[PDB]
Design a protein around this ligand. Structure first.
Ligand code: FE
Ligand code: FE
Ligand code: FE
Ligand code: FE
Lengths: 233, 200, 233, 200, 233, 200, 200
């Protein structure tokens, strides 16, 4: 069974978006009004699932093949998962979901008029390697209009979920694409008060990883909470 | 002071979270292996229970697009980290609220007792993480059981909650479904009866 | 018939890209080695065709309908055609062509592995109005690898042809999209020596012209050689 | 000094120019009305001629993806700017070289004489604009006729070309095709016999 | 009757003051707690009344004669109403109200000790002309103490209401006077987060429009939502 | 991106709004022609109705200084923009709440049906803009009628409100005053039963 | 975008290249072990051949201080990367042009066929890198054999060269030197018949 042998650096709640960020309308009714209660870390919080034995499909991480070829800009989204200490996070679960090239999601509730792509689902999963490396092959998603302000558009983005070594490190986030002019106009993006924090969500064009005459590449590194051994407890 | 690399900032899961983490729910074909809401197989040791509940927003309206992750010890109060569909029991699971009824359910066993870092026993509990559209950073809670009042009264965690009345928000109500032991655990994100959320 | 009443501001050949720009490989063998011969403007050069009576189809300018719905980010590309004096250029011919959302061109010679879109042609034409305005409805094109350097990729772009008042004003160019990281790496773009000239080819996101919950918009104004009346000739 | 708004910078037409400007050639469905290579209808006044030629790069190799625009006076030496497919004659046309043979063709009438700004007559000529992949800014040239030697000798334009030997690069060679009067006009972009290109 | 032919640029709710601005006490209890619901523009929102045939009095816009002469600084308040595109808004209704020279309002509820001016009403209306111009003749209002903080004073100001072409454009605002040291200290003014927005509410002394030996003049231009024609709807 | 000139910023109407927009109300002499609360003249076609209501703040207290503006179609579902006192019907009117009772009244006719931009009919409704001291920027709302359930059910606007319970806040309850057909529409700026406010 | 460390910039080998890479030619004592022009030992499998050539500058003059490096598969189309003087065959060699005749020689075997990354066979070829004074960064080329016309016609690499005439610059001409099979491969750095040079 798992054991309580680690402590995780406390989360900086001023770095992460706050619960109540009114421009992002839905957040108003779905944010607590009472203060979070702080508790010491125990085995309950310092442990989590290890997905090393999950039975992954051959194209789990290849959105081009996992659902003909999809229509859109072919790209590789790769990066590394490390902790605050700069330590690689091996054998961790990285899941992703996104819209198609037109901003259309393959979900019952999406009624946007852009059409679905018969060859595209939009879900991938990948277990990081010994060095914390992950990579997906997909097509660049399109911006999506949504019912926030009368003319709100989400920047093209990919949803990400990262397990990390425990439930204390588990995180859900969104990757944005370098130079997208929509970024600064997004109320969701803007839920993050610090401009420096926003920068961490921007994947960078990575020509060094691109396959000449095939697909481009984007680099997205993920930093999870630093893990340390307990001391003088 | 010493500053480390800043953690990647959180972002809402969004309304379409299902496509990525709850395939069926999204109404899409699933893959061979999926992490879902059945933590224990029929032949797993312990007392088999059914967990169900609803999620409410500040207006007292159901949150139908919520996504939940659970972490618990087996009946021996042991955390089973090696996730495997072949296992009789998995400490980890996922669930979501129906687009219609907006009720989530989980099939597991009552968790055994675990000690805190100081060696003090915690009352049986299930660690919950709540995700959804409108939630910028996931909410952490704990599910306790009404039939464990003795243990509950001595829980070092439950006891950190300054106001007794707030402590009650964490206790699941024992019931029965198809003559099966069930516990109802409703989450109230905001307002009157607002559920206790943790930071760790 | 046409009348020799106007003179056109002389072209700045240092603003425009030169003929010989070696990084753009094709330019080498296709650029003259002799200096251009300058000639005085005559009726021959100061006149040009008027397309007011060309019989345009109803969706000539609508790439979403002129070829099901195409896959990609739905956008409006609009702007104005003016001369160097800032005078609008009414009833002028504006032609555009581009690749699909995946960067595939519907042309025999395009061997890129990105698939064609059964609902997309990629050609439009529009006659500017009384105020020099034009607009197209299309999908945002994707970057395209090409055999220049071993890992060259054109930024997403739309090809444009503008007739203007005479053959002296006729121009073919390329629209690029605001924020595109590929822009500064492109050897065709870099055919232009002045960074300020490059900016002129970049269309800006135009939230004001967008159709909420439908499509975004980009603004691209075009400036043709200034037209003046002959004097003291 | 006074500085106006700068003119939008030119860019190469690219290899795919056909999709935009020569629909057929791109191998695509054309529209009801297209601007093509037949300036004159059979019932058009003037001497009907066929123009043809090839385009060579600096290595002496054919440029199979060139795009050309022509502007010429009618038989009376008059520029007809009102473009209409119903006209017997249009002063404007477009042509391109075959991906195969690399030869372009134009169906028109021999243009009449036009006076320059100073009242001096110019030899009959066709104004041509060359576009293609590798050409950052289109090349301007003029097609003159070998059977207008008397006129050609006196053209104020042709006479601005310093070197006599270069003037000849501009003269189309009269021939016959299928018993029809044709002129061959080859363009040499660079090198030996490089065609004169103009700036105006 | 009116027809749905226009679309109005979406309002920037981060430019305008928000609902809840606690320093302005009354706003606590009079601001919604639920988010506004965004709705697409229809004929209901894109049309509004035209006051072209309203029967205006001869001194409707002259507060010096519309109620002897009032006591106070004689001034002309003039300007133009344009839309965000810079287009003049002709035949539009401009209404204004203000206190007297002492900061006293001719209203039941006004209990300030400064006396009323027997020759001063404080109400004016003016239909803009074909060029979007309006003008009023009045006396400069005095600052007014108000029950907010224990020593709060409104800077001298004139209240304005502008109809515009539709109910979508209608707006109520306040004019402030160049240099008034009380401006930066006002909580109502401070309801506006952006200092740049504040600047727009400041009327500028206009010596060019003043009547020598008679009265001074202030320039106050108003910008209403940009109006455009629908497209590809 | 492209930025236009910024729209002039809104400011509260203040408590003395009446002096400029509700003269009588302010207790001052009115002008020859005023824009007030009688949209329809006795002889105007359609069902003549009386609208009345109160405005409540977040503490549930009456807002006695409110100013409202209304825009509605005529009985024919037609917008009469050319405002004239001679008109039998005007699509525009203004009203305010008494400093005593804190109630506003308007005299009009029940509006006819109008189509949204997509061609779908909207249930009969009155557009309302609310102004008052403490309101930095006016609030937009719609008044719908309880006796048009069928229509209300299908309104593309009413259907944009996510939570059905919130939709109810927009329905005026029919009654009768002096045997005259009336509808009462109360506004709750904040809190329990808070009225839906729109952005367009 | 992502930027890696920049590669150390190239500089010309200079005229004294020999002192460092071709000791003999420099007219200096050699070391025990030297990398030279004999890739195969008499007892090496495959068809033994002699390769020879001259290097020409843009003026048609011999480049007498050139240095070349060759990389080729063995007779079985296999790359022997473990460099050893004891080997019967080495895939790697070095040669230089004589200050006198200005001709280089290499003793090797005709390379077997190797597939490209997409699994398509490439015609037998020798990879060449040329260095010299006046050459800032070395030039890459390939030597193909004229007696492999069939294979040559189908090479995925040779086919990348747009102009067919340019492909011929890469074909070595079979000859005999002292009744021994030889192939002549002349390199023209610039001008007429300029050899195709690659980037990879
Ligand atoms: Fe999303
Ligand atoms: Fe292109
Ligand atoms: Fe005031
Ligand atoms: Fe040296």
């Amino acid at each position: 069974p798992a054991q309580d042998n680690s402590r995780f650096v406390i989360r900086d709640r001023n770095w992460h978006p706050k619960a109540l960020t009114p421009d992002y309308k839905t957040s108003i009714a779905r944010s607590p009004r009472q203060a979070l209660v702080s508790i010491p870390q125990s085995i309950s919080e310092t442990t989590g699932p290890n997905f090393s034995h999950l039975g992954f499909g051959a194209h789990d991480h290849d959105l081009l093949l996992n659902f003909g070829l999809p229509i859109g800009e072919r790209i590789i989204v790769a990066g590394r998962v490390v902790d605050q200490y700069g330590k690689p996070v091996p054998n961790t679960l990285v899941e992703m979901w996104q819209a198609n090239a037109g901003g259309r999601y393959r979900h019952k509730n999406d009624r946007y008029l852009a059409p679905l792509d018969p060859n595209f689902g939009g879900v991938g999963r990948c277990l990081t390697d010994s060095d914390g490396y992950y990579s997906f092959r997909t097509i660049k998603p399109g911006p999506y209009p949504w019912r926030n302000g009368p003319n709100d558009w989400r920047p093209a983005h990919i949803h990400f979920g990262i397990s990390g070594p425990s439930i204390a490190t588990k995180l859900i986030t969104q990757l944005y694409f370098e130079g997208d002019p929509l970024i600064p106009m997004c109320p969701i993006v803007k839920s993050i008060a610090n401009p420096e924090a926003v920068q961490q969500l921007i994947a960078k064009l990575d020509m060094n990883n691109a396959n000449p005459m095939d697909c481009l590449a984007y680099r997205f590194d993920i930093v999870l909470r630093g893990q340390r051994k307990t001391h003088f407890e | 002071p010493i500053e480390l690399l800043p953690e990647t900032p959180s972002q809402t899961a969004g309304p379409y979270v299902h496509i990525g983490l709850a395939l069926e729910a999204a109404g899409n074909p699933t893959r061979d292996q999926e992490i879902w809401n059945r933590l224990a197989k029929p032949d797993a040791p312990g007392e088999h229970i059914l967990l169900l509940g609803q999620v409410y927003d500040g207006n007292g309206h159901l949150v139908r697009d919520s996504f939940l992750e659970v972490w618990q010890a087996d009946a021996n109060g042991e955390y089973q980290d090696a996730y495997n569909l072949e296992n009789a029991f998995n400490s980890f699971g996922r669930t979501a609220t129906t687009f219609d009824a907006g009720e989530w359910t989980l099939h597991t066993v009552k968790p055994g007792v675990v000690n805190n870092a100081a060696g003090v026993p915690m009352a049986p509990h299930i660690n919950i993480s709540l995700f959804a559209r409108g939630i910028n950073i996931h909410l952490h809670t704990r599910l306790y059981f009404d039939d464990e009042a003795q243990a509950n009264a001595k829980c070092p965690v439950l006891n950190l909650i300054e106001q007794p009345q707030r402590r009650e928000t964490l206790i699941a109500k024992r019931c029965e479904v198809d003559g099966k032991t069930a516990y109802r655990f409703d989450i109230r994100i905001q307002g009157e009866g607002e559920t206790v959320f943790f930071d760790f």
